[PDB]
Design a protein around this ligand. Sequence first.
Ligand code: BCL
Ligand code: BCL
Ligand SMILES: CC[C@H]1c2cc3[nH]c4c(c3C)C(=O)[C@H](C(=O)OC)c4c3nc(cc4[nH]c(cc(n2)[C@@H]1C)c(C(C)=O)c4C)[C@@H](C)[C@@H]3CCC(=O)OC/C=C(\C)CCC[C@H](C)CCC[C@H](C)CCCC(C)C
Ligand SMILES: CC[C@H]1c2cc3[nH]c4c(c3C)C(=O)[C@H](C(=O)OC)c4c3nc(cc4[nH]c(cc(n2)[C@@H]1C)c(C(C)=O)c4C)[C@@H](C)[C@@H]3CCC(=O)OC/C=C(\C)CCC[C@H](C)CCC[C@H](C)CCCC(C)C
Ligand SMILES: COC1=C(OC)C(=O)C(C/C=C(/C)CC/C=C(\C)CC/C=C(/C)CC/C=C(\C)CC/C=C(/C)CC/C=C(\C)CC/C=C(\C)CC/C=C(\C)CC/C=C(\C)CCC=C(C)C)=C(C)C1=O
Ligand SMILES: COC(C)(C)C(=O)/C=C/C(C)=C/C=C/C(C)=C/C=C/C(C)=C/C=C/C=C(C)/C=C/C=C(\C)CC/C=C(\C)CCC=C(C)C
Ligand SMILES: COC(C)(C)C(=O)/C=C/C(C)=C/C=C/C(C)=C/C=C/C(C)=C/C=C/C=C(C)/C=C/C=C(\C)CC/C=C(\C)CCC=C(C)C
Ligand SMILES: COC(C)(C)C(=O)/C=C/C(C)=C/C=C/C(C)=C/C=C/C(C)=C/C=C/C=C(C)/C=C/C=C(\C)CC/C=C(\C)CCC=C(C)C
Ligand SMILES: COC(C)(C)C(=O)/C=C/C(C)=C/C=C/C(C)=C/C=C/C(C)=C/C=C/C=C(C)/C=C/C=C(\C)CC/C=C(\C)CCC=C(C)C
Ligand SMILES: COC(C)(C)C(=O)/C=C/C(C)=C/C=C/C(C)=C/C=C/C(C)=C/C=C\C=C(C)\C=C\C=C(/C)CC/C=C(\C)CCC=C(C)C
Ligand SMILES: [Fe+3]
Lengths: 256, 51, 51, 51, 50, 51, 274, 52, 325, 44, 43, 44, 44, 44
Amino acid sequence: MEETFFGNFDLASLSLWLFYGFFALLIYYLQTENMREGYPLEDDDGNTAANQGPFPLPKEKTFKLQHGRGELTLPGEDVQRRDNLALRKTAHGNGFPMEPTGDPMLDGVGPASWSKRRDVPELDAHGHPKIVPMSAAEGFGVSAGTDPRGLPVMAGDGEIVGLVSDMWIDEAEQLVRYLEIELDPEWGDGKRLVQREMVRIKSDRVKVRSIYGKHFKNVPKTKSPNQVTLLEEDKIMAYYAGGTLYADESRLEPQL
Amino acid sequence: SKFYKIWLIFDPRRVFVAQGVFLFLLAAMIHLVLLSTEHFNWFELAAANAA
Amino acid sequence: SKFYKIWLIFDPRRVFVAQGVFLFLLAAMIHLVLLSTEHFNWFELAAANAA
Amino acid sequence: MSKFYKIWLIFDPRRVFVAQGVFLFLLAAMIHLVLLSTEHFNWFELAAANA
Amino acid sequence: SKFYKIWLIFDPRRVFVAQGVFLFLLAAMIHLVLLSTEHFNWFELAAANA
Amino acid sequence: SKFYKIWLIFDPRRVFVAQGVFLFLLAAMIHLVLLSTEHFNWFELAAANAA
Amino acid sequence: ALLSFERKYRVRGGTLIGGDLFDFWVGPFYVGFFGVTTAFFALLGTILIFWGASQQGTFNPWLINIAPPDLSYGLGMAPLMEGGLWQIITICAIGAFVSWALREVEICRKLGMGYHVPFAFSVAIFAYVTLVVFRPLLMGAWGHGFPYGIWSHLDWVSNTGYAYLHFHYNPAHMIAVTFFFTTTLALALHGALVLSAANPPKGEEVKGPDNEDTFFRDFIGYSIGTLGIHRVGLLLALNAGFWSAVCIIISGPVWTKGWPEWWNWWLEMPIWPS
Amino acid sequence: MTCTITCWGIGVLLGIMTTVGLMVVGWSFLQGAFMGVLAWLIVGGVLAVAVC
Amino acid sequence: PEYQNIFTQVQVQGPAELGVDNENNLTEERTTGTGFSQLIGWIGNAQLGPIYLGWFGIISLVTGTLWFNIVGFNMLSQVGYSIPEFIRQLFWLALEPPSPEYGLRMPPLDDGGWFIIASFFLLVSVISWWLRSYQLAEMHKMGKHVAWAFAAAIWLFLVLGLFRPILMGSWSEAVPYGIFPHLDWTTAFSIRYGNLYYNPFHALSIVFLYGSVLLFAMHGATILAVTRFGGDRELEQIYDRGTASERAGLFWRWTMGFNATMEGIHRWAWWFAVLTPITGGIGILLTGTVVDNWFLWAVEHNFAPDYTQDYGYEAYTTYDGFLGR
Amino acid sequence: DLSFTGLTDEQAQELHSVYMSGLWLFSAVAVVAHLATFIWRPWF
Amino acid sequence: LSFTGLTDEQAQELHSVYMSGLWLFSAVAVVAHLATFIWRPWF
Amino acid sequence: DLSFTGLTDEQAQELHSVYMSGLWLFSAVAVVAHLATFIWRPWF
Amino acid sequence: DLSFTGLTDEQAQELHSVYMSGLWLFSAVAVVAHLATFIWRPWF
Amino acid sequence: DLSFTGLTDEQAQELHSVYMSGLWLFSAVAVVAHLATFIWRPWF
Ligand code: BCL
Ligand code: BCL
Ligand SMILES: CC[C@H]1c2cc3[nH]c4c(c3C)C(=O)[C@H](C(=O)OC)c4c3nc(cc4[nH]c(cc(n2)[C@@H]1C)c(C(C)=O)c4C)[C@@H](C)[C@@H]3CCC(=O)OC/C=C(\C)CCC[C@H](C)CCC[C@H](C)CCCC(C)C
Ligand SMILES: CC[C@H]1c2cc3[nH]c4c(c3C)C(=O)[C@H](C(=O)OC)c4c3nc(cc4[nH]c(cc(n2)[C@@H]1C)c(C(C)=O)c4C)[C@@H](C)[C@@H]3CCC(=O)OC/C=C(\C)CCC[C@H](C)CCC[C@H](C)CCCC(C)C
Ligand SMILES: COC1=C(OC)C(=O)C(C/C=C(/C)CC/C=C(\C)CC/C=C(/C)CC/C=C(\C)CC/C=C(/C)CC/C=C(\C)CC/C=C(\C)CC/C=C(\C)CC/C=C(\C)CCC=C(C)C)=C(C)C1=O
Ligand SMILES: COC(C)(C)C(=O)/C=C/C(C)=C/C=C/C(C)=C/C=C/C(C)=C/C=C/C=C(C)/C=C/C=C(\C)CC/C=C(\C)CCC=C(C)C
Ligand SMILES: COC(C)(C)C(=O)/C=C/C(C)=C/C=C/C(C)=C/C=C/C(C)=C/C=C/C=C(C)/C=C/C=C(\C)CC/C=C(\C)CCC=C(C)C
Ligand SMILES: COC(C)(C)C(=O)/C=C/C(C)=C/C=C/C(C)=C/C=C/C(C)=C/C=C/C=C(C)/C=C/C=C(\C)CC/C=C(\C)CCC=C(C)C
Ligand SMILES: COC(C)(C)C(=O)/C=C/C(C)=C/C=C/C(C)=C/C=C/C(C)=C/C=C/C=C(C)/C=C/C=C(\C)CC/C=C(\C)CCC=C(C)C
Ligand SMILES: COC(C)(C)C(=O)/C=C/C(C)=C/C=C/C(C)=C/C=C/C(C)=C/C=C\C=C(C)\C=C\C=C(/C)CC/C=C(\C)CCC=C(C)C
Ligand SMILES: [Fe+3]
């Protein structure tokens, strides 16, 4: 207690070193638990990298997915990998950026890149699709803020492409996830979705600064107008953010 | 008179609890005020009266 | 003479609740400031009168 | 006067009794603590005073 | 008299769980109050007697 | 006689874990207050006995 | 190396002042124009710390102490071994921190994600900036910055804290601390929510957002949501960093007296019946 | 918003006015500020609820 | 500029969401009344959900109010039931722990006896609330991470007021129940036992406390940066990761050389938060009981810096020079 | 007629009739209590 | 014309009893102030 | 008639009789408690 | 006739009898404990 | 026929009988322990 053993190493020192050993084990546990995705490492050529780091991959853990979606083991065989990427290396070595072969936004390679998620809509606790248009919502309505329905949509370059037809809401958590854009015949056809986190709503109009007017006709569509699958949901969101770098050369080129 | 029409506006089950907490809080506050004053503090007066 | 139609724009239950809170708060505030001054502090006057 | 039984037509017996039980005990505990604070009515200490 | 009707209002499961905890806390509280006073602290009285 | 019906409304698994935890804590807590008391501290009393 | 999904995101572009000249990766790190300046400033600052440690006479990490100059030197540059080295390391530290934040802008611009992280880091930079260059200017001496030591800068906090007579009564420190405790409280509960939902007892299905949303509804009667917690949590942490900047920038150049005596306004009001 | 933001703006203007109004008749800046801050919370909340 | 997802630009309200429920049948003890607030909806969910009226929660609420009231009426009795003085001195009044000359023995009511009674009720309320968190997670078939994270806060809570005073030999080591008084205790505790800066476990707790705020600014901004990719839906990103998890990981892999998963982030988030009171609880528990002077502990363990300059103002300036005369 | 909470005119009349009796009874005890405490230690 | 869904038939009736309550509230306030003025005048 | 809690007139009269019987019994104990407390060191 | 809990009048009647038997037993030992303490060291 | 916990009457009768046997066994040891310690050092 108040007396020391082998030198100045008292009980406070013993507790301090005991925590040091525990923390080292904790850091190993914490770091390994983050290796369940994206591992093993690879090089720019796609082969397995010679170096895998100082932390070995953890034991396989299983998630009992709900709504009868089977099980899920994270370490090994990521099903979200995209096969045909439209990129080729700018250098024969490693550590250098890729240059898209074709249209970066259409192919979805850079900031426009999506992930091969499940081709099924996300489900709430009831088993119903999580994101649905507010028209199909039972008793939902705008409670505060500016209602964007009917407001014209202004692209990044200022072009007016159409008016908002509906908002795809998240009835499980009661928030807006998308805005439906009814494209004018000049700027495209059909309807397209833009995520709420990428859109800015003004008093009279609603604007997206990430995508120019000519790129709305190429926004990924949804197979059904009543629900969106995670694959389409990932493609749609990625496309708009891809325009933050690919709408024009001025965004990709250095700003100074 | 005709003061009974207040119940056509006020909800009896929401105003009865309103005055119920209000009356006790008012009663408790006034009792505390009396205890603060040394003239009306009946607890200290009993001690002083006994001497 | 034609003030009866103030309620045409004011909701009774919406203004009665505010009025009831306002009247008690005003009455307490006037009572409190009246207790602040030593001339109208009826608790201290009672103590001084019996002294 | 005798129509006080109608209070149960507004208040359900379950919620009022639970509120009443907590209120009465807290009131009883509040008062007992107050007397315990005062030196004259602290029955525990005056027992020690009597030898 | 006829207070048996209280069980038609109070859940027997609920009231007993509250009663069990309430009685013990009111039994520990009072016991500590006597332990506070030197007149009723039976532990100190044994020391004083001896 | 008829106290056996307490198990018809209390879950035996829930009560026993509460009973076991409560019994030990009470047994321990009483053992500490004896240690705090100098008259009933059997540890320091043995030293006093040994003189 | 690269992750299993990193190849696609490694595209050229999204640079502020640099171009393809610095647009490359070194291992996992991304080098940019500001990654070049970060590497230069961080290495120069780190080496000068050890150079000062060599001249200080000790290499013990606990005992290494590079201190600002005396208050007599004012805002001018001091001799290198008399405090001037601390000023240069401060200049290197500001360059390293600003470039690191600007590099993070290049990281997120290349990935198409928002600029929330570099903005959030800039608040922490502002907390350091207000501690080392803003507060000294308001006092007219570089010697008011904290020394660059593991335990020496703890002595500065202790001495500065007691230099205002029980710093706990500082109103901005009072606000800043309760943001620090709430952020850790929010971090624990939010981290627990996701882990609990994702890691149920064995043999039980994983819980979705609805199950974790209703848990605090049954726990504390209101759940801020999956999206709400991240934005309120960022503001909780940024407020903690911002109010920490306030509590130290108002200490010397605003309230030279003791901090309890600041509360004399509350104790001495006309409303109170003295 | 709009109405609520404007009502809050009226309160902060009133809070500033009360901050300097009490300073004129005495008090101090910190004492006046607390009343000004308190006024902003009260009348700002009341206006944002009743007017809007 | 681009829309930063700090305040929602439009919010919708539908039927109130009661809960998920299962055969554990949580509905009976769940309230049937909910409300909606648009002011809080600008930053989070706008629904004021229904309390689950469990027995652990009710006992914690009732006994917590008992501790709150007992401290309150002693505070009101401090100034002789003078409400204006009670309001004026609200931040200064407290329920002081017992005097040190009583030890573990029960002190008189005016000298900490009511402190023990209030502390006992506070202990019951705090523990009962933890049992509520454990039971609620059990009834929801969720992980007990909330209960374990709370239990870490209980550790420092128990060390500060229960564990340390028991094995320090006196109840006087507990923390007073006051706004400013427990700040005075916090400062006096460091002064009495040297300097808690030089307590390694206090330093360790500070490391995790800064790290906890650091992570949750990192995590809060990173999720808001990938919220354009549905990053706020963390749970679905754990089961089926999209570009939100990948971009968030690659942002920190390209910045600081390593990253986390959408699930592994909360393990990092959980542990620094949990380690903050665990390390602090250890440091307080062995402060005074083991080490009675932390600076002297630092001196003998060679991590207290040494200064070679003079300690007087006369060595740097003069009184006339400071005054400008 | 006006009914913001139901309570058809007949229902409100009988509710106030017993409420007034309760109010008068509560105030009658208050008057007696105030008269009794005024005799004990008057405040005027 | 109307903002709270009331007509002239009952809004006039509502004000009729509100003034009765206002006068009764003022009447007991007038005598209260008159009694206080006699006891402790402030003019 | 005007049953906010699904409780009829007959139940209210029956329940109030029990409540008043309990109330008077509780008040009777309090009165005897106060009367004895006033005999032993009164507060007036 | 009215029972929020759901248990019948007969079920309430027997449960109260058992509860009272427990209450009197709990009270009876409490009175003896309270009585025996008074001979030990009275507080009046 | 009032099993709130889904446990029949017969099972409760044997549950209490065994529980009392444990309770009396626990109390009997406590009584002997209390009797032994009172002779060693009485507290009354
Ligand atoms: C006697 C001492 C007084 C006291 C006096 C002070 C003083 C004096 C100060 C504080 C300040 C603070 N006090 Mg105080 N304070 C006291 C008691 C407390 C208590 C408590 C429980 O008792 C608490 C919780 C706090 C809490 C705090 C926080 C509000 C704040 C800490 C700094 C911060 O926010 O980050 C701000 C700092 C930064 C964010 C650093 C930025 C980091 C940079 C950008 C990145 C670093 C990179 C670096 C190179 C590492 C890279 C290396 C590796 C490659 C990774 N105080 C005691 C009573 N307190 C400090 C403050 O506010 O500072 C603004 C301050 O100056
Ligand atoms: C002069 C002041 C001393 C000082 C003395 C102390 C003391 C004394 C302590 C700390 C401790 C802490 N100090 Mg220090 N500390 C100082 C300077 C600092 C500085 C700084 C920049 O200067 C900082 C950042 C810190 C930082 C910290 C944290 C790391 C740590 C507390 C973590 C915590 O919240 O636990 C979380 C736990 C709690 C706060 C209590 C948990 C509360 C319970 C669980 C909740 C009950 C709720 C209650 C019933 C109310 C409910 C009401 C609701 C509304 C319903 N200290 C100086 C040296 N410091 C603590 C420690 O040592 O940790 C090892 C501590 O005890
Ligand atoms: C500012 C608001 C809050 C916050 C946020 C925050 N911090 C951040 C970020 C964010 C959002 C990042 O994105 C960024 C990051 O990438 O973290 C991993 C970061 C960061 N904040 C960090 C630390 C940190 N944050 C802290 C706190 C906080 N983090 C605040 C509470 C603290 C405290 C107060 O204890 C520390 C120590 C780093 C991990 C990282 C910044 C990395 C960086 O700047 O890298 C470039 C520089 C170097 C590699 C070395 C430079 C060396 C210098 C040239 C010389 C030495 C200077 C220094 C002043 C000496 C110190 C001596 C002694 C006092 C130790
Ligand atoms: C991991 C460490 C961090 C942490 C974590 C943490 N805290 C937690 C949890 C977790 C994981 C919970 O699950 C739990 C919780 O439910 O949070 C919402 C909690 C909690 N930690 C809390 C506070 C808290 N945490 C703190 C800090 C921390 N806890 C660390 C930073 C601090 C500090 C040190 O400053 C505090 C003060 C609470 C919000 C909550 C614990 C509350 C609880 O469950 O029981 C406590 C008591 C009550 C609820 C009863 C209080 C009494 C009344 C409600 C008050 C008075 C009401 C009214 C005035 C009555 C008037 C009556 C009269 C009119 C008669
Ligand atoms: C859900 O979403 C999320 C994720 O999951 C998708 C995440 O993961 C994260 C990230 C958060 C995590 C918890 C993940 C794990 C991370 C941590 C535990 C750390 C964060 C917590 C802390 C308490 C901070 C601890 C600090 C650490 C670990 C240090 C990291 C910071 C540093 C500054 C050090 C690293 C930097 C270095 C080495 C320098 C950078 C390099 C350059 C700029 C390159 C420059 C090069 C040149 C110019 C060329 C010269 C080349 C040379 C000399 C060759 C040398 C080569 C080298 C490699 C050095 C978040 C927020 C998130 O929300
Ligand atoms: C700070 O300043 C200082 C100077 C210190 C200060 O003190 C300031 C004091 C100030 C400002 C005084 C403010 C006091 C005021 C304004 C007095 C309000 C008090 C009032 C108004 C008394 C209501 C009594 C109501 C009862 C008690 C009814 C009893 C009802 C009974 C129980 C019947 C209920 C049952 C039914 C109705 C059944 C009907 C049902 C059906 C028909 C189904
Ligand atoms: C700081 O400065 C110092 C100098 C200190 C200060 O003191 C400043 C003082 C200042 C500024 C004075 C501010 C006071 C003012 C302006 C006085 C407003 C007060 C007023 C106006 C009194 C209304 C009373 C009306 C009632 C209370 C009616 C009662 C109504 C009854 C209850 C009937 C209700 C029922 C119905 C209507 C039923 C209808 C229904 C159907 C028809 C269905
Ligand atoms: C600073 O403050 C200081 C100065 C300290 C202070 O002292 C302030 C004190 C202040 C302000 C006094 C505030 C106290 C007041 C106002 C006293 C309220 C107290 C009252 C009114 C007592 C009711 C008692 C009624 C019972 C307890 C009946 C028992 C009922 C029994 C149990 C029967 C129930 C059973 C059934 C009904 C079954 C029937 C069911 C069916 C038929 C189904
Ligand atoms: C500052 O405060 C200071 C001064 C410190 C202070 O002291 C304040 C003290 C204050 C305020 C005193 C407040 C105390 C009060 C009011 C006393 C309440 C206490 C009561 C009322 C005692 C109930 C006892 C009931 C039992 C124990 C029954 C036993 C039940 C038995 C076990 C039967 C259970 C049922 C079955 C077995 C079968 C049933 C089931 C079926 C038939 C299915
Ligand atoms: C209108 O309102 C009225 C009604 C007036 C009112 O009430 C208002 C109430 C008002 C204003 C009170 C406001 C309270 C305030 C500001 C106090 C803040 C509180 C703070 C800062 C707490 C710090 C210390 C906490 C620890 C650290 C505890 C440690 C607890 C330990 C762990 C307990 C351990 C248990 C025991 C020691 C018992 C042992 C005995 C047995 C087991 C038998
Ligand atoms: Fe998160």
